[PDB]
Amino acid sequence: TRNGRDSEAKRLGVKRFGGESVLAGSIIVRQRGTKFHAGANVGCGRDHTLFAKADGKVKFEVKGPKNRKFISIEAE
Amino acid sequence: AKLHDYYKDEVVKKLMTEFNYNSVMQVPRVEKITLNMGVGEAIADKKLLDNAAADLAAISGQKPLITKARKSVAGFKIRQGYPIGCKVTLRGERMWEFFERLITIAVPRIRDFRGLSAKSFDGRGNYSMGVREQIIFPEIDYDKVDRVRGLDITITTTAKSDEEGRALLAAFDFPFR
Amino acid sequence: DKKSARIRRATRARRKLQELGATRLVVHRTPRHIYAQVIAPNGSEVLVAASTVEKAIAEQLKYTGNKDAAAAVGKAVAERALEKGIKDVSFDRSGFQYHGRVQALADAAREAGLQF
Amino acid sequence: GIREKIKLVSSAGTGHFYTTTKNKRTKPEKLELKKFDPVVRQHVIYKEAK
RNA sequence: AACCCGAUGCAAACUGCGAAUACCGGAGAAUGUUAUCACGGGAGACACACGGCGGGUGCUAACGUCCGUC
RNA sequence: UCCUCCUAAAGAGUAACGGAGGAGCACGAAGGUUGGCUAAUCCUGGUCGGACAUCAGGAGGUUAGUGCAAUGGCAUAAGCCAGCUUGACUGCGAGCGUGACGGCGCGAGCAGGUGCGAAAGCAGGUCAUAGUGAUCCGGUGGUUCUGAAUGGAAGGGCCAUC
RNA sequence: UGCCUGGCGGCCGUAGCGCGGUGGUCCCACCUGACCCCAUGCCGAACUCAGAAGUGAAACGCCGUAGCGCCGAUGGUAGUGUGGGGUCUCCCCAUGCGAGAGUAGGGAACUGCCAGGCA
């Protein structure tokens, strides 16, 4: 009804994938809902943004009794 | 204390004799006894909840609890969290004293009292009924009555069946039906 | 359920201690006996374990579970930790309250020389 | 509109002050809060919020 | 006249399942005039049309109109 | 002017007078600590009470709620209750991404005063996207920073702010 | 060197849901009291403190029950990148890859460290 106004599509999703050598402060993935959670040596911001707390190689793995997917980082 | 001792003394023995249980703990026991006032008329005027709470506190050995509305429904003009009804839950010495007073004086003196309703079972073991003119309780002075109010009695029984509930109440003898 | 409530009230603490990878002391208090354990950084090995069930602590007490028994077991675990070099180990409440035998054991260990 | 801006000045002589948005229509009472003031190097009670 | 039952059809605002493409990072034999990136000067352009591939739009009526790629 | 879902072809982005829409708000508590609790709906029994005002048990196991229109997620509950609360801090922030650009989002940690919690630990706002608006000229407190010979004043710049 | 019980971990359904059996010597539930540590938006309901008289009501450890949920091949089937062809709003040829559900089959989980009791 009298439409014709489309909002800007904010870009979400994973932008840095597994097996990526990422330094501290990088953002592994930006998902609106918590599709991917944090694991060891990984931090989460207010806007569900996952970042690496130290340099290393990132990886994704299914974890948790509820069948959730976590993102972790290991020494490279 | 009196009712607790009475329950511990011979209720277990009679239940074993008339049912042939296995363990001494097979005897069902009532977890709690709750009185409820769902007046629902407090919406018209707010100076009824305080009177109901005072009456409940006087009747029982402790102050009551005001139960907020579960859901916001427009059919009764009640919003979410509305304190419409009140209750008093008793367990232990207070419950024993209240039940003793009830059975001793209140139940025999009920106007046009012939017997309770055995069919009033929730199908699990608890015993729930309702009584009008709570003034039947001797605590409330007749001349001090302000409005005619009801009461709902619910005794939670761990018994899994109505027959087990009746067997447990046999200690109270279930005066009449 | 009695155990389900404790599990759901202590899972947050377990997660918080595990994600940090810091050794923690976990205490489970029961009316009869109380158990204390120190978990390794990996989270799969226990370095020190103690409880009132042990005869060495049960032979000098009147009742199995009480404030005195909690203090005794706390002192024993603190002494063993000091002997083994297990200083600077965090603590987890395991969903209990810091107002009874749990806090008595915590204070006993703190006096014995453990920080947490 | 309904809201109006209110300044928040430290009770002390420090000139540094904060600003916020509030409406006095439902909250005529004044503001009682403490915040760190760089000039004094310590938390100071704020008043005269207007 | 709500919910519900016996069905009836559908899915762009459904996925307890789920590809084939395509994009991305680490190792590597082979090959391309470094075909890759950075800096400075100068441009042009900033009106496109058709076929294929999956479509919106109109009543496939069209050599109507707009989308992602060769 | 901005925000949500499909169109929009499984990185991201992606137009059309296409299909449905909403936002110009608000909380100094509706945010944080510690502790405790865990919905809609259905069946069973009952005094006003009936399809639902409240009470007790069972099934249900998050479809309830998560302020707004919409989105994914929230059980470790981000949902509800109780004590304190101002971290709705100060100056920094390597780095990461987005757009041609102004601009925009995240961010561990650094020195200080700190709130909560016995400690471990959280707190640089609201589970997150819309509630937005510059340039020029002028208002408020200081900054003797500058000051058309000097003392000054007048005038000009930083900050918080119309 | 074995069996049982309790605590902390690797995965969350071959790990589960329903029914029966089994167990109090080590440990746990309740069972005793709480004017006291602690607290109820009332209640020792929840939580906590002091005690141990009974017994597995209920919960819980383990085995059977294949009654329900799940996974699970082999291929078939729908499709798809490439070049070509056809009767082209849709299909076929050669090639790389490849569905879901269902089918044979499984299942009462497996496994690492510490404490106590019974041999």
Side-chain angles (χ1 to χ4, degrees), chain A residues 2-75, chain B, chain C, chain D:
Chain A
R2 302 309 314 173
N3 70 340
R5 41 187 167 87
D6 185 5
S7 69
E8 192 282 340
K10 188 179 183 300
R11 63 208 67 186
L12 288 303
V14 55
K15 312 186 74 176
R16 317 300 140 188
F17 310 130
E20 298 286 8
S21 299
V22 300
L23 77 177
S26 60
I27 285 68
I28 293 75
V29 50
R30 295 170 243 172
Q31 57 285 43
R32 193 65 177 175
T34 182
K35 304 300 189 308
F36 305 149
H37 307 64
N41 190 18
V42 175
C44 186
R46 51 168 284 279
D47 63 334
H48 304 274
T49 300
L50 288 298
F51 60 91
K53 296 154 62 178
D55 309 338
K57 185 190 299 303
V58 66
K59 61 185 296 304
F60 318 147
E61 59 286 342
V62 179
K63 283 302 306 116
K66 279 60 176 178
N67 302 270
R68 299 289 77 88
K69 312 183 72 170
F70 300 170
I71 319 302
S72 60
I73 186 175
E74 58 283 2
Chain B
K2 165 56 183 177
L3 288 184
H4 192 238
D5 300 330
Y6 175 86
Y7 169 83
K8 294 200 308 306
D9 288 329
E10 79 300 331
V11 176
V12 58
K13 185 181 294 184
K14 73 176 185 58
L15 291 169
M16 263 290 296
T17 53
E18 73 187 4
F19 202 94
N20 305 328
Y21 287 108
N22 299 121
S23 180
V24 65
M25 301 126 199
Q26 298 299 142
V27 171
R29 53 185 175 182
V30 301
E31 179 60 16
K32 64 190 183 179
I33 286 81
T34 183
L35 281 59
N36 178 24
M37 339 296 155
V39 299
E41 195 62 13
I43 61 182
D45 177 67
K46 64 180 295 304
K47 179 44 185 64
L48 287 70
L49 300 174
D50 300 330
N51 178 23
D55 299 330
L56 269 52
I59 291 166
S60 61
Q62 60 188 3
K63 62 183 296 305
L65 180 72
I66 190 75
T67 58
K68 61 179 66 58
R70 308 182 189 179
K71 304 172 290 185
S72 181
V73 298
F76 304 102
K77 310 301 181 181
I78 56 181
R79 303 293 77 181
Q80 179 62 10
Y82 195 92
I84 191 66
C86 50
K87 64 176 183 178
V88 177
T89 303
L90 303 81
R91 309 178 185 87
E93 299 294 351
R94 286 74 170 275
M95 173 273 293
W96 292 124
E97 182 178 0
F98 199 85
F99 191 85
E100 176 62 14
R101 195 278 303 272
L102 260 290
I103 63 184
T104 48
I105 172 56
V107 175
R109 202 180 68 182
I110 286 170
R111 193 273 302 176
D112 187 5
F113 171 79
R114 191 187 65 84
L116 291 302
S117 59
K119 179 58 176 179
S120 300
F121 289 144
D122 61 352
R124 305 299 302 179
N126 304 332
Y127 174 63
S128 300
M129 283 189 63
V131 298
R132 53 179 172 275
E133 277 69 25
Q134 80 304 359
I135 60 177
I136 53 174
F137 299 155
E139 194 284 334
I140 302 81
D141 182 69
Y142 300 159
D143 192 9
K144 298 179 67 176
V145 304
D146 300 330
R147 188 260 290 185
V148 301
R149 288 170 170 174
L151 173 62
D152 190 328
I153 311 302
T154 297
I155 302 91
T156 304
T157 314
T158 58
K160 299 173 178 177
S161 57
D162 301 330
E163 63 92 352
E164 287 179 0
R166 293 184 184 88
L168 177 58
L169 294 175
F172 307 145
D173 190 70
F174 188 78
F176 296 98
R177 185 182 180 183
Chain C
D1 185 70
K2 184 65 175 298
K3 178 166 61 177
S4 70
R6 185 182 63 85
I7 291 290
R8 68 168 182 264
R9 291 181 286 92
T11 181
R12 257 198 177 184
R14 265 87 70 87
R15 192 286 317 274
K16 179 58 179 177
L17 272 294
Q18 186 178 7
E19 62 83 14
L20 181 57
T23 52
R24 61 163 183 275
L25 165 56
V26 65
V27 62
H28 187 357
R29 196 280 306 174
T30 62
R32 275 289 192 177
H33 296 270
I34 180 172
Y35 325 96
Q37 298 181 357
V38 182
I39 194 174
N42 56 18
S44 300
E45 298 295 350
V46 63
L47 304 78
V48 169
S51 177
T52 57
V53 180
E54 296 181 356
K55 316 309 179 186
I57 182 170
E59 59 80 19
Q60 64 284 41
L61 48 68
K62 297 170 289 302
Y63 188 78
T64 57
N66 53 18
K67 292 184 292 184
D68 300 330
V73 63
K75 292 177 64 56
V77 63
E79 183 178 0
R80 195 177 300 93
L82 293 175
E83 290 177 0
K84 294 180 67 176
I86 309 300
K87 184 62 176 182
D88 294 354
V89 166
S90 300
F91 163 84
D92 184 3
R93 59 140 185 175
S94 303
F96 296 90
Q97 295 184 357
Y98 190 79
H99 301 76
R101 277 168 279 187
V102 180
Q103 62 80 17
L105 194 167
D107 300 330
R110 192 178 303 276
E111 185 176 0
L114 274 288
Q115 72 91 352
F116 53 87
Chain D
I2 300 173
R3 280 220 201 177
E4 59 283 7
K5 72 175 191 167
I6 63 100
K7 62 185 69 57
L8 187 65
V9 183
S10 174
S11 60
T14 295
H16 177 61
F17 68 95
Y18 270 91
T19 302
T20 318
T21 60
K22 198 66 64 173
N23 180 22
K24 63 158 187 172
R25 220 287 295 277
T26 176
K27 292 189 296 299
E29 66 283 4
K30 305 305 301 184
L31 184 161
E32 299 75 2
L33 294 172
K34 306 189 298 303
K35 295 186 294 184
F36 177 84
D37 192 331
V39 181
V40 75
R41 198 56 159 171
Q42 189 65 9
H43 296 271
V44 61
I45 297 170
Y46 288 83
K47 284 288 183 296
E48 61 274 0
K50 278 77 71 172

